[PDB]
Amino acid sequence: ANGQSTRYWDCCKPSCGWRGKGPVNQPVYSCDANFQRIHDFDAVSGCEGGPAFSCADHSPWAINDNLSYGFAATALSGQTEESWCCACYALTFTSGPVAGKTMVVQSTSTGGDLGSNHFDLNIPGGGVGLFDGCTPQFGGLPGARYGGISSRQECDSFPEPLKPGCQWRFDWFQNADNPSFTFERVQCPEELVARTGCRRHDDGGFA
Ligand SMILES: OC[C@H]1O[C@@H](O[C@H]2[C@H](O)[C@@H](O)[C@H](O)O[C@@H]2CO)[C@H](O)[C@@H](O)[C@@H]1O
């Protein structure tokens, strides 16, 4: 399949962080203002004036020079959350400075695009976007509303837990701006499930 991407980090509780979003063992973990895991999956989102924010460990990272693991807010043409929550997809970039690189990402939230295959990649400092839960969480992140910061050095003022994800963007990712990609759903690697805690019942069917 073919799709396009954007990047973001709004500190909001992930949509797949609520129970009943799909056949899973447990939904995606949420974190408190101090980036620590929360036990209550029914907690109010930090973007709804509540205490449930996005976990900093739900950041992208490089496995090797050709592959990275990550997370994204997804929207698939003619599909619903039930079919993508916690599902993993192997993306192979077809444009940008990272063309040819692969990245396996787990869907932890939902984007607002309709009629398209869109992956809004979780990237600290990639842009708060529509919602801003980072201001309530810890005073906010620097950068333009969409797209976020423009220089790696800007990651220096970020809360410690968000720095590596922020920097990953200017390293493995070579600051690629909205690269397009081909993608197929694949079984979620153990490392991703270990970060979110969420695994789909139909996951084993994939390879
Ligand atoms: O709780 C209202 C509504 O929330 C949806 O999840 C939110 C998430 O909590 C928020 O942090 C993010 O920024 O937006 C999404 C979508 O509004 C959830 O998916 C719904 O089931 C729930 O009723």
mmCIF file of C-alpha atoms and ligand atoms in Angstrom:
data_model
loop_
_atom_site.group_PDB
_atom_site.id
_atom_site.type_symbol
_atom_site.label_atom_id
_atom_site.label_comp_id
_atom_site.label_asym_id
_atom_site.label_seq_id
_atom_site.Cartn_x
_atom_site.Cartn_y
_atom_site.Cartn_z
ATOM 1 C CA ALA A 1 0.000 0.000 0.000
ATOM 2 C CA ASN A 2 0.991 3.655 -0.423
ATOM 3 C CA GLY A 3 0.796 6.407 2.181
ATOM 4 C CA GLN A 4 2.166 9.753 3.281
ATOM 5 C CA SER A 5 3.513 11.109 6.536
ATOM 6 C CA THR A 6 3.702 14.082 8.841
ATOM 7 C CA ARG A 7 5.319 14.398 12.268
ATOM 8 C CA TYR A 8 4.056 15.551 15.657
ATOM 9 C CA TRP A 9 4.098 15.391 19.449
ATOM 10 C CA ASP A 10 1.264 17.078 21.346
ATOM 11 C CA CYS A 11 1.649 15.317 24.722
ATOM 12 C CA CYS A 12 -1.994 14.165 24.494
ATOM 13 C CA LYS A 13 -3.216 10.805 25.803
ATOM 14 C CA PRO A 14 -3.164 8.437 22.829
ATOM 15 C CA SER A 15 -6.559 7.452 21.382
ATOM 16 C CA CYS A 16 -5.575 3.776 21.534
ATOM 17 C CA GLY A 17 -4.882 4.485 25.195
ATOM 18 C CA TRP A 18 -8.573 3.905 25.946
ATOM 19 C CA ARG A 19 -10.098 0.436 26.391
ATOM 20 C CA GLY A 20 -12.526 -0.785 23.738
ATOM 21 C CA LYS A 21 -10.560 0.494 20.756
ATOM 22 C CA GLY A 22 -9.799 -2.981 19.467
ATOM 23 C CA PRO A 23 -9.159 -6.637 20.410
ATOM 24 C CA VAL A 24 -6.086 -6.137 22.579
ATOM 25 C CA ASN A 25 -4.628 -7.553 25.777
ATOM 26 C CA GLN A 26 -4.544 -4.009 27.235
ATOM 27 C CA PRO A 27 -4.622 -0.541 25.642
ATOM 28 C CA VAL A 28 -1.572 1.708 25.108
ATOM 29 C CA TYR A 29 -0.066 2.978 28.385
ATOM 30 C CA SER A 30 -0.584 6.637 29.305
ATOM 31 C CA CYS A 31 1.844 8.643 31.430
ATOM 32 C CA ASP A 32 1.517 11.327 34.077
ATOM 33 C CA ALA A 33 3.049 14.792 33.811
ATOM 34 C CA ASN A 34 6.379 13.287 34.918
ATOM 35 C CA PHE A 35 6.504 10.711 32.109
ATOM 36 C CA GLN A 36 5.703 7.808 34.450
ATOM 37 C CA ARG A 37 3.232 5.088 33.496
ATOM 38 C CA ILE A 38 -0.362 5.419 34.688
ATOM 39 C CA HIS A 39 -2.424 2.464 35.935
ATOM 40 C CA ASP A 40 -5.840 3.851 34.995
ATOM 41 C CA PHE A 41 -6.553 3.618 31.251
ATOM 42 C CA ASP A 42 -9.812 5.533 31.772
ATOM 43 C CA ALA A 43 -7.996 8.635 32.998
ATOM 44 C CA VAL A 44 -8.839 12.011 31.455
ATOM 45 C CA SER A 45 -6.420 13.188 28.758
ATOM 46 C CA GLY A 46 -3.935 15.979 29.421
ATOM 47 C CA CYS A 47 -5.488 17.592 26.367
ATOM 48 C CA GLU A 48 -8.892 17.473 28.036
ATOM 49 C CA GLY A 49 -7.649 19.219 31.202
ATOM 50 C CA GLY A 50 -6.729 15.893 32.786
ATOM 51 C CA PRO A 51 -3.622 14.003 34.004
ATOM 52 C CA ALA A 52 -3.096 11.484 31.199
ATOM 53 C CA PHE A 53 -0.290 12.523 28.835
ATOM 54 C CA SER A 54 1.794 10.777 26.195
ATOM 55 C CA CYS A 55 4.660 8.598 27.449
ATOM 56 C CA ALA A 56 8.101 9.861 26.399
ATOM 57 C CA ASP A 57 9.252 6.296 25.740
ATOM 58 C CA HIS A 58 6.772 6.119 22.859
ATOM 59 C CA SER A 59 9.510 7.747 20.783
ATOM 60 C CA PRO A 60 11.196 6.585 17.565
ATOM 61 C CA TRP A 61 14.712 5.099 17.676
ATOM 62 C CA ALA A 62 17.241 3.533 15.334
ATOM 63 C CA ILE A 63 17.761 -0.218 15.278
ATOM 64 C CA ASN A 64 20.520 -0.026 12.653
ATOM 65 C CA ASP A 65 21.485 2.289 9.784
ATOM 66 C CA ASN A 66 18.545 0.993 7.695
ATOM 67 C CA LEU A 67 15.833 0.446 10.300
ATOM 68 C CA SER A 68 14.053 2.279 13.121
ATOM 69 C CA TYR A 69 11.123 1.434 15.371
ATOM 70 C CA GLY A 70 8.511 4.036 16.221
ATOM 71 C CA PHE A 71 4.924 5.113 16.810
ATOM 72 C CA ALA A 72 2.344 7.148 14.930
ATOM 73 C CA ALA A 73 -1.176 8.543 14.864
ATOM 74 C CA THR A 74 -2.728 6.764 11.904
ATOM 75 C CA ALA A 75 -5.705 7.063 9.576
ATOM 76 C CA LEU A 76 -6.273 4.447 6.861
ATOM 77 C CA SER A 77 -8.582 4.956 3.881
ATOM 78 C CA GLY A 78 -12.023 3.534 4.601
ATOM 79 C CA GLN A 79 -10.977 1.928 7.895
ATOM 80 C CA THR A 80 -11.666 2.558 11.602
ATOM 81 C CA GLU A 81 -9.561 2.582 14.799
ATOM 82 C CA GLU A 82 -10.639 -0.964 15.579
ATOM 83 C CA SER A 83 -8.534 -2.135 12.638
ATOM 84 C CA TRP A 84 -5.369 -0.153 13.358
ATOM 85 C CA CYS A 85 -5.094 0.403 17.121
ATOM 86 C CA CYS A 86 -1.836 -1.186 18.295
ATOM 87 C CA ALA A 87 -1.264 -2.721 14.871
ATOM 88 C CA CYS A 88 2.263 -2.414 13.440
ATOM 89 C CA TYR A 89 3.221 -1.469 9.901
ATOM 90 C CA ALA A 90 6.538 -1.711 8.080
ATOM 91 C CA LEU A 91 7.130 1.535 6.195
ATOM 92 C CA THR A 92 9.662 1.879 3.401
ATOM 93 C CA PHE A 93 10.299 5.512 2.564
ATOM 94 C CA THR A 94 10.036 6.412 -1.102
ATOM 95 C CA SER A 95 11.009 10.089 -0.926
ATOM 96 C CA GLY A 96 13.110 12.465 1.132
ATOM 97 C CA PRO A 97 16.715 11.988 2.292
ATOM 98 C CA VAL A 98 15.811 8.627 3.872
ATOM 99 C CA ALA A 99 14.405 6.975 0.753
ATOM 100 C CA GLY A 100 15.098 3.264 1.052
ATOM 101 C CA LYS A 101 15.138 3.216 4.851
ATOM 102 C CA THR A 102 12.551 1.200 6.739
ATOM 103 C CA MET A 103 10.708 1.891 9.945
ATOM 104 C CA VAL A 104 8.304 -0.369 11.817
ATOM 105 C CA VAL A 105 5.734 1.699 13.676
ATOM 106 C CA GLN A 106 2.896 0.811 16.018
ATOM 107 C CA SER A 107 -0.366 2.767 15.720
ATOM 108 C CA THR A 108 -1.106 4.284 19.111
ATOM 109 C CA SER A 109 -3.472 7.063 18.120
ATOM 110 C CA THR A 110 -5.695 8.300 15.308
ATOM 111 C CA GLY A 111 -5.173 11.156 12.883
ATOM 112 C CA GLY A 112 -7.919 13.395 11.514
ATOM 113 C CA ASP A 113 -7.408 12.760 7.808
ATOM 114 C CA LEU A 114 -10.113 10.968 5.838
ATOM 115 C CA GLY A 115 -9.906 9.145 2.524
ATOM 116 C CA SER A 116 -6.164 8.595 2.806
ATOM 117 C CA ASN A 117 -3.403 6.421 4.282
ATOM 118 C CA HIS A 118 -1.721 8.893 6.611
ATOM 119 C CA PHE A 119 0.887 8.240 9.301
ATOM 120 C CA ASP A 120 1.609 11.194 11.623
ATOM 121 C CA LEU A 121 4.861 9.995 13.221
ATOM 122 C CA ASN A 122 5.440 10.506 16.946
ATOM 123 C CA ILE A 123 8.455 12.834 17.088
ATOM 124 C CA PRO A 124 9.193 15.014 20.130
ATOM 125 C CA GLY A 125 9.430 18.559 18.805
ATOM 126 C CA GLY A 126 7.953 17.576 15.465
ATOM 127 C CA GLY A 127 5.105 19.956 16.147
ATOM 128 C CA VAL A 128 2.304 20.168 18.663
ATOM 129 C CA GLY A 129 -0.301 20.486 15.877
ATOM 130 C CA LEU A 130 -4.077 20.702 16.330
ATOM 131 C CA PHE A 131 -3.930 20.105 20.092
ATOM 132 C CA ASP A 132 -1.379 21.233 22.670
ATOM 133 C CA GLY A 133 -1.128 19.112 25.816
ATOM 134 C CA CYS A 134 2.548 19.965 26.226
ATOM 135 C CA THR A 135 1.833 23.439 27.587
ATOM 136 C CA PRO A 136 -0.328 21.989 30.415
ATOM 137 C CA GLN A 137 2.092 19.093 30.992
ATOM 138 C CA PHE A 138 5.287 21.064 31.517
ATOM 139 C CA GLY A 139 5.089 24.567 30.080
ATOM 140 C CA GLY A 140 5.148 23.590 26.416
ATOM 141 C CA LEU A 141 7.666 22.764 23.695
ATOM 142 C CA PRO A 142 9.430 25.272 21.441
ATOM 143 C CA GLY A 143 8.940 25.385 17.683
ATOM 144 C CA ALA A 144 6.254 26.230 15.152
ATOM 145 C CA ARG A 145 2.775 24.780 15.808
ATOM 146 C CA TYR A 146 3.097 22.333 12.909
ATOM 147 C CA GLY A 147 6.543 20.984 12.020
ATOM 148 C CA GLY A 148 7.899 22.045 15.401
ATOM 149 C CA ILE A 149 11.559 22.961 15.841
ATOM 150 C CA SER A 150 13.987 23.415 12.951
ATOM 151 C CA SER A 151 17.405 22.649 14.530
ATOM 152 C CA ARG A 152 18.788 19.691 16.501
ATOM 153 C CA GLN A 153 20.298 22.094 19.009
ATOM 154 C CA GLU A 154 16.746 23.138 19.968
ATOM 155 C CA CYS A 155 16.274 19.690 21.537
ATOM 156 C CA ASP A 156 18.616 20.854 24.311
ATOM 157 C CA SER A 157 15.868 22.645 26.263
ATOM 158 C CA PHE A 158 13.506 19.660 26.123
ATOM 159 C CA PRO A 159 12.586 17.626 29.187
ATOM 160 C CA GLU A 160 15.213 14.877 29.400
ATOM 161 C CA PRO A 161 12.913 11.935 28.500
ATOM 162 C CA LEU A 162 11.917 13.602 25.201
ATOM 163 C CA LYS A 163 15.448 14.479 24.030
ATOM 164 C CA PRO A 164 16.444 11.242 22.284
ATOM 165 C CA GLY A 165 13.271 11.138 20.189
ATOM 166 C CA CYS A 166 13.785 14.803 19.370
ATOM 167 C CA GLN A 167 17.372 14.159 18.254
ATOM 168 C CA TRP A 168 16.530 10.967 16.344
ATOM 169 C CA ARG A 169 14.808 13.291 13.882
ATOM 170 C CA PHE A 170 18.045 15.014 12.845
ATOM 171 C CA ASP A 171 20.138 11.845 12.910
ATOM 172 C CA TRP A 172 18.719 8.593 11.469
ATOM 173 C CA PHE A 173 15.805 10.568 10.003
ATOM 174 C CA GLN A 174 18.028 13.290 8.496
ATOM 175 C CA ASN A 175 15.277 15.847 9.205
ATOM 176 C CA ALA A 176 13.165 14.379 6.385
ATOM 177 C CA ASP A 177 10.057 16.519 5.764
ATOM 178 C CA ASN A 178 6.938 14.415 5.287
ATOM 179 C CA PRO A 179 8.489 11.504 3.377
ATOM 180 C CA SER A 180 6.099 9.217 1.464
ATOM 181 C CA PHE A 181 6.272 5.421 1.801
ATOM 182 C CA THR A 182 4.900 1.995 0.879
ATOM 183 C CA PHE A 183 3.666 -0.113 3.792
ATOM 184 C CA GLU A 184 2.265 -3.452 4.889
ATOM 185 C CA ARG A 185 1.009 -4.541 8.267
ATOM 186 C CA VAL A 186 3.428 -6.877 10.060
ATOM 187 C CA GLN A 187 3.474 -8.645 13.411
ATOM 188 C CA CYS A 188 4.535 -6.137 16.051
ATOM 189 C CA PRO A 189 8.119 -6.521 17.168
ATOM 190 C CA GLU A 190 8.481 -7.296 20.864
ATOM 191 C CA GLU A 191 10.343 -4.036 21.496
ATOM 192 C CA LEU A 192 7.347 -1.909 20.479
ATOM 193 C CA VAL A 193 4.843 -3.876 22.548
ATOM 194 C CA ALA A 194 7.267 -3.590 25.488
ATOM 195 C CA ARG A 195 6.940 0.211 25.260
ATOM 196 C CA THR A 196 3.163 0.514 24.822
ATOM 197 C CA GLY A 197 2.028 -2.736 26.441
ATOM 198 C CA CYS A 198 -0.576 -3.111 23.695
ATOM 199 C CA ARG A 199 -0.772 -6.207 21.465
ATOM 200 C CA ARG A 200 -3.621 -7.107 19.062
ATOM 201 C CA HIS A 201 -5.248 -10.561 19.150
ATOM 202 C CA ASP A 202 -4.872 -10.871 15.386
ATOM 203 C CA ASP A 203 -1.174 -9.952 15.521
ATOM 204 C CA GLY A 204 0.158 -13.503 15.447
ATOM 205 C CA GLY A 205 -1.542 -14.033 12.109
ATOM 206 C CA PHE A 206 1.001 -11.674 10.596
ATOM 207 C CA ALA A 207 4.732 -12.332 10.280
HETATM 208 O O1 LIG B 1 -12.478 10.912 25.936
HETATM 209 C C1 LIG B 1 -13.095 11.487 24.790
HETATM 210 C C2 LIG B 1 -12.735 10.647 23.563
HETATM 211 O O2 LIG B 1 -11.300 10.611 23.506
HETATM 212 C C3 LIG B 1 -10.672 9.929 22.379
HETATM 213 O O3 LIG B 1 -9.264 9.953 22.578
HETATM 214 C C4 LIG B 1 -8.667 11.243 22.440
HETATM 215 C C5 LIG B 1 -7.465 11.352 23.361
HETATM 216 O O4 LIG B 1 -7.955 11.149 24.687
HETATM 217 C C6 LIG B 1 -6.850 12.747 23.249
HETATM 218 O O5 LIG B 1 -5.724 12.807 24.127
HETATM 219 C C7 LIG B 1 -6.418 13.023 21.796
HETATM 220 O O6 LIG B 1 -5.739 14.266 21.708
HETATM 221 O O7 LIG B 1 -7.645 12.954 20.952
HETATM 222 C C8 LIG B 1 -8.335 11.672 20.973
HETATM 223 C C9 LIG B 1 -9.550 11.789 20.015
HETATM 224 O O8 LIG B 1 -10.470 12.776 20.464
HETATM 225 C C10 LIG B 1 -11.179 8.481 22.362
HETATM 226 O O9 LIG B 1 -10.595 7.827 21.245
HETATM 227 C C11 LIG B 1 -12.706 8.417 22.389
HETATM 228 O O10 LIG B 1 -13.094 7.043 22.457
HETATM 229 C C12 LIG B 1 -13.203 9.167 23.652
HETATM 230 O O11 LIG B 1 -14.617 9.081 23.800
#
